[PDB]
Amino acid sequence: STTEEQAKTFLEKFNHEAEDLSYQSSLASWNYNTNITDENVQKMNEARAKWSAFYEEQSRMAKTYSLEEIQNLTLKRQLKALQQSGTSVLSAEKSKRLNTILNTMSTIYSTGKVLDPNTQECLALEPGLDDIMENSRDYNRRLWAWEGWRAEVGKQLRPLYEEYVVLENEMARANNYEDYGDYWRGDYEVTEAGDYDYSRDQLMKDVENTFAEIKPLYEQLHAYVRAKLMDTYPSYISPTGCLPAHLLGDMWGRFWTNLYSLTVPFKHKPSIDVTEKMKNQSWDAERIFKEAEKFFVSISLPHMTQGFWDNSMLTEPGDGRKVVCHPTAWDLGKGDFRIKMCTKVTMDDFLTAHHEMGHIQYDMAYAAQPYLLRDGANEGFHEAVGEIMSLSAATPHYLKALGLLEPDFYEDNETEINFLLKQALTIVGTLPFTYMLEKWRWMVFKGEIPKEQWMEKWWEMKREIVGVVEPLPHDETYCDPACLFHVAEDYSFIRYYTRTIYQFQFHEALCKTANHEGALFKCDISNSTEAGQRLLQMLSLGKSEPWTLALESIVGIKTMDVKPLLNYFEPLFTWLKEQNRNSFVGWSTEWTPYS
Amino acid sequence: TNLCPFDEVFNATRFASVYAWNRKRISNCVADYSVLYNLAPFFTFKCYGVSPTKLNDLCFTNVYADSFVIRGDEVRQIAPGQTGNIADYNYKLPDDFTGCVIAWNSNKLDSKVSGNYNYLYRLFRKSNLKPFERDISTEIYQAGNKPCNGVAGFNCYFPLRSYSFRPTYGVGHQPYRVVVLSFELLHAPATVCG
Ligand SMILES: *[C@@H]1O[C@H](CO)[C@@H](O[C@@H]2O[C@H](CO)[C@@H](O[C@@H]3O[C@H](CO)[C@@H](O)[C@H](O)[C@@H]3O)[C@H](O)[C@H]2NC(C)=O)[C@H](O)[C@H]1NC(C)=O
Ligand SMILES: *[C@@H]1O[C@H](CO)[C@@H](O[C@@H]2O[C@H](CO)[C@@H](O)[C@H](O)[C@H]2NC(C)=O)[C@H](O)[C@H]1NC(C)=O
Ligand SMILES: *[C@@H]1O[C@H](CO)[C@@H](O)[C@H](O)[C@H]1NC(C)=O
Ligand SMILES: *[C@@H]1O[C@H](CO)[C@@H](O)[C@H](O)[C@H]1NC(C)=O
Ligand SMILES: *[C@@H]1O[C@H](CO)[C@@H](O)[C@H](O)[C@H]1NC(C)=O
Ligand SMILES: *[C@@H]1O[C@H](CO)[C@@H](O)[C@H](O)[C@H]1NC(C)=O
Ligand SMILES: [Zn+2]
Numbered sequence: 001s002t003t004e005e006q007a008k009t010f011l012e013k014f015n016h017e018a019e020d021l022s023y024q025s026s027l028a029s030w031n032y033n034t035n036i037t038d039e040n041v042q043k044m045n046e047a048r049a050k051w052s053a054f055y056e057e058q059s060r061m062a063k064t065y066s067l068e069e070i071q072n073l074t075l076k077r078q079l080k081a082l083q084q085s086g087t088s089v090l091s092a093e094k095s096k097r098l099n100t101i102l103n104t105m106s107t108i109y110s111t112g113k114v115l116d117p118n119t120q121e122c123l124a125l126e127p128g129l130d131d132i133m134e135n136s137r138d139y140n141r142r143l144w145a146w147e148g149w150r151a152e153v154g155k156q157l158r159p160l161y162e163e164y165v166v167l168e169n170e171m172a173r174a175n176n177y178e179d180y181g182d183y184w185r186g187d188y189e190v191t192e193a194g195d196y197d198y199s200r201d202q203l204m205k206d207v208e209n210t211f212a213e214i215k216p217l218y219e220q221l222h223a224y225v226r227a228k229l230m231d232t233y234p235s236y237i238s239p240t241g242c243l244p245a246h247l248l249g250d251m252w253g254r255f256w257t258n259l260y261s262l263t264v265p266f267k268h269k270p271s272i273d274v275t276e277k278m279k280n281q282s283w284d285a286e287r288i289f290k291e292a293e294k295f296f297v298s299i300s301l302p303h304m305t306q307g308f309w310d311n312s313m314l315t316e317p318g319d320g321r322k323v324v325c326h327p328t329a330w331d332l333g334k335g336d337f338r339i340k341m342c343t344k345v346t347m348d349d350f351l352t353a354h355h356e357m358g359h360i361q362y363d364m365a366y367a368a369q370p371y372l373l374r375d376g377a378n379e380g381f382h383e384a385v386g387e388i389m390s391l392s393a394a395t396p397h398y399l400k401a402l403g404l405l406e407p408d409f410y411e412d413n414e415t416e417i418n419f420l421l422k423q424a425l426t427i428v429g430t431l432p433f434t435y436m437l438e439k440w441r442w443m444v445f446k447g448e449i450p451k452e453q454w455m456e457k458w459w460e461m462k463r464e465i466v467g468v469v470e471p472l473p474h475d476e477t478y479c480d481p482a483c484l485f486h487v488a489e490d491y492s493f494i495r496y497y498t499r500t501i502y503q504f505q506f507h508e509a510l511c512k513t514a515n516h517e518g519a520l521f522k523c524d525i526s527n528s529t530e531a532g533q534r535l536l537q538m539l540s541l542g543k544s545e546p547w548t549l550a551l552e553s554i555v556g557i558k559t560m561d562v563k564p565l566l567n568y569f570e571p572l573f574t575w576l577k578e579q580n581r582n583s584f585v586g587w588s589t590e591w592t593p594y595s
Numbered sequence: 596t597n598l599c600p601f602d603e604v605f606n607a608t609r610f611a612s613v614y615a616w617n618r619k620r621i622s623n624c625v626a627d628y629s630v631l632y633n634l635a636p637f638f639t640f641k642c643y644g645v646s647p648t649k650l651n652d653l654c655f656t657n658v659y660a661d662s663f664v665i666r667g668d669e670v671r672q673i674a675p676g677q678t679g680n681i682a683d684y685n686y687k688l689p690d691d692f693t694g695c696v697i698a699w700n701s702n703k704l705d706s707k708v709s710g711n712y713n714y715l716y717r718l719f720r721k722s723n724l725k726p727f728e729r730d731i732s733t734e735i736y737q738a739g740n741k742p743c744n745g746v747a748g749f750n751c752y753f754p755l756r757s758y759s760f761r762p763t764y765g766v767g768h769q770p771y772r773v774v775v776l777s778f779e780l781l782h783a784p785a786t787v788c789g
Contacts (some may be wrong), residue, residue, distance in 0.1 A: 001740055006750060009738040012718065016756055027763070061749065305765060335765015 007065045007075055014058055014082070015371050022371070023333040025051040030330055034313055034340060036322040059085055073192070074544065078372045081543075089174040090167070098167045101160050102490060108156055109488040114148035125149065125251075133251050134258050139236055143471055146246035154479035161482055162451060164490075169445065181445035184492050187379055190546040196558065198548060204442070207494075210501060210562040211435050217569060218428055220576040222467050223585040225256070228263040240584050241591035242469035252484055253468060256429035260422050265575075266414040272396060274404040278345050285315040285343040288350055291402065292357040295393065299525060300532035301361055308337050308360070316342040329356045331363035351390045358389035365539035377538075377547035380498035385539065387503040388510070397524045420521060420572040428569075431497060436465045438494045440481060452476060463589045473594055501560055502551070508564035509555040510535065520568050599624040599787075604660050605634055605697075610705075610772050613663045613685050614717040614755055615731045621658035626651065626789035635699040639670055639771075644693030645778065656784035659694075659777040661686065664705060664714050666758070668767045670698040673775065682724075684717045686775075689726040694777040705770040706760040714758045714770070 028047035032040040062082045070076045087095065112125035123129050123145075132145045168180040177183040185200040222243075229247065230237050236244065249258035293304050317323065325342035332338065339356050343349050362385050366374055376382035392398065399405040440458055443449050449457050455478060459470050474480065486493050510531045511523040525531040538554045548558040566573075599621055611617040628651050631637060640647070665673075665681055672679045675690050682688075688696075705711055719736040735743035739750035747753050760770045 001738065006738050009719065009736075009750075009752070013752060016718065020759055064749070307763065307765060311763060332763075334761075334768045336763055337765075 003065060003069050004071060004075070007070070007079060010062070010065070011075065011078055011370075014062075017054065018058070018371050019333060021051050021054050023336070026330070026332040027336075030332060030338065030340075033324055033328075034321070036324070056088070059083065059088075074373075076192075077543070078370065081372050085175070087171055090171050094167055094170070098164070098171075101164050101167070105157060105160055105164070105482075105488050109153065109483075109485065112149070112153065114145070114152050117144070129251065133246075134249065137232060139233055139247070142246045146251070147472065149251065150474075150478060150480060150483055153483050155477055157482040157488065158477060158479040161479060165444065179445045179447070181442040184494070185442075187492075188547070190548060193546050193549075196546045196548045198546075206560050207435060207438075207497065210497075210560060211431070213562050214428075214431060214565070217566060217573060217576075218432060219585055219587075220573065220580060221424060221428060222587070223580050223583055224576055225259065225263055226587075227580070227583045229259075232262060236593070238591050240586065240588055242463055242467050242587050242589070244471055244593060245468050246471055248468065252433075253466075254430055254433055254484075256425045257422070260425060263421070263425075265417055265421055269412060269414045269418060271418065272399070272405070272415070273347055274350075274399055275346050277404045278347075278350075283345050285345075288343065288345075288353045289314055289339075289357070291350075292353045292393075295354065295389075295398075295526055296357060296361060298527050299535075300529040301536070302364065304360075305335070305337060305364075307335070308339070311336070312338040313340050314343055327352050327356055329359035329363065331360075335367075337363055351393055354393040355386040355390045358386040361385075362539050365536060366542035368540065369542040369544055373543040375543050377541065377543060377545075377550040378498070379492070379495045380502055381547065381550070383495075383499045384503040384506055385535075387499075388507045391503075391507055392523070392525050395522055395524050397522070398526060401526070416521070417572065417575055420569065423521075424569055424572055427500060431500060432466045434493060434496045436461050437481060437484070437487075438497075439465075441487070441493070455480065460589075467587045469592055471593055498560065501562055501565060504565040504568050505551075505555050505561065508567060519571060520564075521571065597624040599626045599658075601626070601630055604662055604774060605631065607662070610662050610664045612715045613665050613681055614715055615729060616661050616663040616686050619660040619662070621660060622656070622786050624658075624787050626658065626787055628789060631697065635701075637697050637699040639673075639696060639698030639773070641674070642695040643675060643688075644691065645695070647695060651789045654780070654785045654788040655778045656781045656786040657777075657779035658787055659775075659779070661775040661777065662773070664701070664758075664770050664772050665698075665716075666767070667700070667765075667769050667771050670771050670773060673698065673773060680718065681716065684720045684724060684730075687724045687726050687728070688775070692777070693779075694775060696773065696775050698771050698773040700766075700769060701772040702762065702769045705772070706762045706764075708762060711760045711770070712757045714760070715755045716758065717755050719752055719754055 025044075025047040028040075028044045032044040059082060062079060063085075065079065067076070067079060067083065070079065087098065090098065112129075113122050114124075114129060115122055121128075123132075129145050129149055132141060136142055136145075165180070172178070172180045172183045175183065177186065182200055185203050188198055188203050189200055190196055190198040226237065226239075226243055229243065230239065233244075233247065236247075245253060249256055297303060313323070316325070323340075323342065327341035328339070330336075330338040330340060337360050339353075339360065341349075341352065341356065343353070359382070362376070362382060396405055396409060396411060400407060400409060440449075440461055443457070444454065455474050455476055458481060459474075462468050462470075481487050485491075507523070508520060510525050511520060513534050514523070514525045514528040514531045516523050516525075534554060538550050541550050541553075551560075552558045600619070604619060628649075631640075645651075663686065669679065669681045671677070672681045673686070673688060673696050675688055675692050677688075705714070717730070719738075720730065724730065733754055735745060735747055736752045736754055737743050737750065738752065741750065743751045758770070760768075
């Protein structure tokens with residue numbers, strides 16, 4: 001009896017047990033989410049506890065079989081995926097401390113409350129501070145809200161973070177990973193596949209090179225935004241300096257969407273909205289998903305099951321039942337695919353339906369694989385497929401074919417410039433912020449930043465890379481990066497950069513193979529069957545093959561290249577160079593609002 | 596007229612499992628084959644070795660009705676020369692077969708919301724099944740170099756799993772009822788004519 005066949009038998013047992021347990025847990029979770037009562041909460045908690053206990057015992061058993069003496073590659077990948085024990089390696093004393101620290105940080109972040117002048121009320125993060133940051137245009141109010149939310153949370157969160165870092169570093173060291181940063185980067189690692197190999201170290205260099213290529217376009221966009229913001233606050237903004245942190249349209253600066261109203265190039269020209277046509281034609285909730293299914297059939301992807309239409313919640317119930325209206329796509333397992341969404345008759349819900357249908361299509365595509373190999377190729381693959389569908393479903397050509405936009409519609413250069421400007425804000429504002437935050441966390445975990453520079457180095461990197469400067473000086477009492485939800489919830493934050501790059505790589509490859517003539521930002525892959533079969537080659541691999549091979553299949557190269565992203569924004573680059581002739585395209589670290 | 600005991604198999608109330616399927620021997624009867632049409636969407640009506648174009652006006656010495664319940668995806672393994680787990684370690688049809696396999700969807704009958712664990716199947720056995728063999732023995736399987744001794748711990752596995760059907764599954768996992776009508780004509784008998 002060779003070890004290989006013993007592992008085969010063990011995995012054959014594990015697949016059958018795990019599939020049923022996972023289906024039961026997912027069904028309980030769906031019932032809770034679409035029916036919010038304490039009884040459903042009890043059922044969900046019990047099912048989750050059962051699944052966790054089973055997975056823990058199976059992971060303990062799987063280690064007995066040595067990873068060596070294995071020949072088949074798929075079995076080796078499955079056993080490696082199952083054998084990862086996570087935080088179990090930590091002792092009894094440290095595990096409880098880590099759980100307590102994580103729960104305390106989550107509760108402190110959730111229990112947000114900053115008082116206001118005149119003792120008017122008490123404002124939480126939502127919806128008080130969020131609305132104030134999103135809508136107010138008063139320097140004093142935004143500065144006060146930003147400072148209060150920063151201090152009231154960071155002062156409490158600072159002591160916990162160092163102990164959390166120490167514990168997580170120890171845990172990573174036990175698992176043979178150098179530190180927590182290496183453990184987080186180990187999600188992009190490929191071994192034993194020549195010419196398809198990747199290393200945890202090379203990811204940093206790839207990200208650095210991609211950002212270095214991105215930087216000029218971001219510089220032009222930042223200079224334009226600074227010039228436009230000069231009007232609102234002439235006294236507070238230097239012409240050739242970094243922008244104030246609290247004036248970026250949101251609490252942290254992750255997105256720049258809310259600054260569109262100030263910085264719309266052509267105010268006279270309106271945007272393309274088809275809500276009125278949908279209302280006039282009595283478009284109901286079902287029609288939108290019907291049209292999304294029609295589009296996916298057009299690309300020659302398969303239809304929707306008959307369990308999707310009967311069991312999904314495609315509209316708010318209307319009864320007393322309380323639901324969470326966050327739109328999600330559910331893959332319960334064993335052939336059950338559903339969508340939960342409180343649909344309204346708007347264009348935004350049209351695009352969201354297309355996105356969720358793309359997620360359901362990916363889930364249906366990779367269903368053939370075993371249980372432990374049913375997911376995106378990497379952590380960033382699953383959302384790019386959703387994003388490209390909403391990219392396609394917004395072009396005026398599609399909305400003219402569907403009958404919403406009138407046939408005599410005429411496209412303006414100005415309207416296209418406005419659309420590209422909004423897209424550029426939303427997509428490009430987050431890239432420097434994401435890269436800088438992940439670089440800072442990697443440096444902190446690696447120990448290259450001493451405990452007395454956690455706030456000097458953070459703002460120094462923000463000045464150098466992002467182009468933003470703090471409004472008021474902060475000592476080591478403050479912990480600015482810990483105010484963000486992801487940092488306080490121990491979530492990886494490097495899946496928002498690779499996703500953005502992969503989305504445009506896919507949307508360039510498919511548009512190329514769909515025989516399209518014209519600018520990339522106006523492309524439609526509907527009524528093209530080559531794109532559907534070029535996409536199905538990647539969507540049906542799951543995790544069976546390395547992500548390098550999966551990427552090469554659709555685009556043609558085994559590397560993350562940011563050339564298509566710049567190709568998408570080619571029309572905007574020329575316009576932003578035209579408008580920024582007089583202004584200075586750059587920022588200098590030295591100047592600071594403190595002086 | 597010896598009308599066959601059909602309508603006591605196609606219209607039964609409890610089909611058996613696939614590890615111990617149900618075999619009925621039909622002989623000395625008239626076999627009307629227009630009763631099937633009204634039963635259900637009998638989408639699987641494959642016939643191997645004979646011609647199903649209403650050529651059943653011949654005479655056969657024996658008819659064998661083998662009934663069981665399987666998954667939707669596994670009704671393609673009821674065929675000559677197939678491999679899987681409903682063939683290797685379960686009901687296996689010979690390479691040369693002269694019969695008709697009828698499989699139809701019975702979701703409304705055999706699926707309960709909480710689950711239907713009444714049906715079972717076999718996951719592990721030492722060697723593949725010879726055609727038309729049954730193995731109802733339940734001995735602890737051994738994948739290692741240690742005696743089982745009657746306890747299922749490490750490397751010792753109970754042989755038969757459970758299907759556990761539910762109404763919310765996909766069509767690929769819903770329960771399908773399968774009846775196999777094997778025919779047999781020996782050295783010139785004239786027993787069952789239709
Ligand atoms: C994808 O496929 C075709 C275009 O290749 C579109 O389907 C049908 O295309 C025909 C073109 O001959 C059109 O039908 C015609 O519509 C007029 C009304 O304007 C009608 O009076 C004619 O009798 C004829 O049926 C039309 O575009 C379309 N059919 C219908 C009923 O709308 C399809 O729209 C394409 N999809 C996309 C997204 O481009
Ligand atoms: C939401 O959950 C409640 C229970 O938390 C459900 O109410 C019960 O439903 C069962 C049927 O499964 C009945 O037998 C009970 O009499 C109901 N009441 C109680 C107090 O248990 C409710 O049906 C769920 N909502 C929906 C739409 O099914
Ligand atoms: C691994 O096992 C699967 C099982 O079907 C087989 O298809 C595949 O060829 C095997 N690969 C290697 C490298 O042995
Ligand atoms: C759509 O708008 C037109 C405008 O003339 C109106 O006549 C028609 O009644 C509207 N249809 C609706 C509201 O369903
Ligand atoms: C449309 O693009 C710009 C933006 O308005 C404009 O200057 C240009 O003249 C227009 N294109 C042509 C071909 O006139
Ligand atoms: C099973 O019973 C139904 C009852 O209406 C009947 O229509 C059908 O023909 C029966 N199936 C047979 C006779 O195979
Ligand atoms: Zn999504």
